[PDB]
């Protein structure tokens, strides 16, 4: 079923993985838990100076923390967590059926 | 840290064929531009011609040839200004090993043949017979440091 869990922070994607693994085991599920996909980082290397200087620069990076949740016991009580939208702050969930 | 004290010198790994540390140190100095295999193959084909032109095995011949290369006095320059500034100083045993390997290779590269198949082995048998070009600059150091002997 492969509920995709990816986000910028690591404290938020871990506590939102604890939500979906808790709100599924209360229903009739057989959850294969969160395994961590490798992070797809990306480095941006701007230069520090206003006008001129190379040879002195600041590197920037942004990291997405990818996990996935899959269940293989679909009941209408299990999808109450799927229809039930929780923690919408900085996590998107690509729900596949 | 060359002013806190001395640098801790590190260990090397001896050769598998000759079972010698001195062979592997010769491999690393003829290793031009990090190519380990393409230089080690040439040394492994530059002591067969040694063992062809002399019946003895080359691990005896190597340490016999370098003794006509390794000098016993050299010149370290002391900043005395208006003096000769060239003090004849004997050689430490670590530099005694290294500087013989240096002259053996640096004049092996300036011979008539192109392949170091036989550029190297010709100068070894010259150094085994106390002649050639890498021997004759040891005598040039032994006509320079032994001429200015007023600074023992």
């Amino acid at each position: 079923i492969r509920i995709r869990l990816k986000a910028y922070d690591h404290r938020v994607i871990d506590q939102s993985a604890e939500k979906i693994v808790e709100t599924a085991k209360r229903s009739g599920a057989d959850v294969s838990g969160p395994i961590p996909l490798p992070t797809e980082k990306s480095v941006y290397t701007i230069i520090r100076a206003v006008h001129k200087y190379k040879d002195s620069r600041e590197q920037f990076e942004q990291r997405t923390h990818k996990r996935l949740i899959d269940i293989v016991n679909p009941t209408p009580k299990t999808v109450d967590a799927l229809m039930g939208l929780n923690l919408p702050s900085g996590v998107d969930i690509e729900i596949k059926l | 840290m060359p002013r806190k004290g001395s640098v801790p010198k590190r260990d090397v790994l001896p050769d598998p064929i000759h079972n010698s540390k001195l062979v592997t140190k010769l491999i690393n100095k003829i290793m031009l531009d990090g190519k380990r295999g393409t230089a080690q193959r040439i040394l492994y084909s530059a002591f067969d011609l040694v063992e062809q032109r002399s019946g003895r095995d080359a691990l005896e011949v190597f340490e016999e040839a370098i003794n006509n290369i390794m000098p016993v006095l050299e010149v370290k320059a002391r900043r005395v200004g208006g003096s000769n500034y060239q003090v004849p100083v004997e050689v430490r045993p670590e530099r005694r090993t290294t500087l013989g390997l240096r002259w053996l290779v640096n004049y092996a590269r300036l011979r008539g043949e192109k392949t170091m198949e036989d550029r190297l082995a010709n100068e070894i048998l010259d150094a085994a017979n106390n002649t050639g070009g890498a021997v004759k600059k040891r005598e040039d150091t032994h006509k320079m440091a032994e001429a200015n002997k007023a600074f023992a």
């Binding site: 290397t45 190379k54 040879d55 002195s56 620069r57 590197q59 | 790994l13 050769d15 598998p16 380990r36 295999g37 080690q40 193959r41």
Partner: protein, 127 residues
């Protein structure tokens, strides 16, 4: 009997196992002399089980992963060294004092910006 150890050096993981028999290595299901390039560093690669003298004792048959040929080698002699301490566990001091069982101590150094490559500063003219 399968004494399965791992071993790493220079961004190249190497997991081994120990089936009894004699000394014969099957790195990536093929011969060593046709896989490792020039046969010099293989007798340096046999150094860890040399001090326990188990030459005609163990076939290994490594599955290696990543790195280069001196990164795949020097990682299976560290590979079987973690497996030799579950074959001869009292012989740990024989491998600790001589080489193999230390570590993956060091890999390539980071390229700093404002520089050519990896601590080699570029040339400038006017001193």
């Amino acid at each position: 009997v399968e004494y399965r150890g791992t071993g790493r050096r220079k961004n190249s993981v190497a997991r081994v196992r120990l089936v009894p028999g004699e000394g014969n290595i099957t790195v990536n299901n093929r011969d060593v002399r046709e896989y490792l390039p020039f046969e010099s560093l293989i007798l340096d690669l046999n150094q860890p089980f040399d001090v326990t003298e188990t030459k005609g004792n163990y076939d290994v048959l490594v599955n290696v992963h990543g790195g280069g040929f001196t990164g795949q080698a020097q990682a299976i002699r560290h590979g079987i060294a973690r497996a030799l301490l579950e074959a001869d566990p009292e012989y740990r001091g024989s491998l600790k004092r001589a080489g193999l069982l230390t570590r993956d101590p060091r890999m390539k150094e980071r390229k700093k910006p404002g520089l050519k490559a990896a601590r080699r500063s570029p040339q400038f003219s006017k001193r």
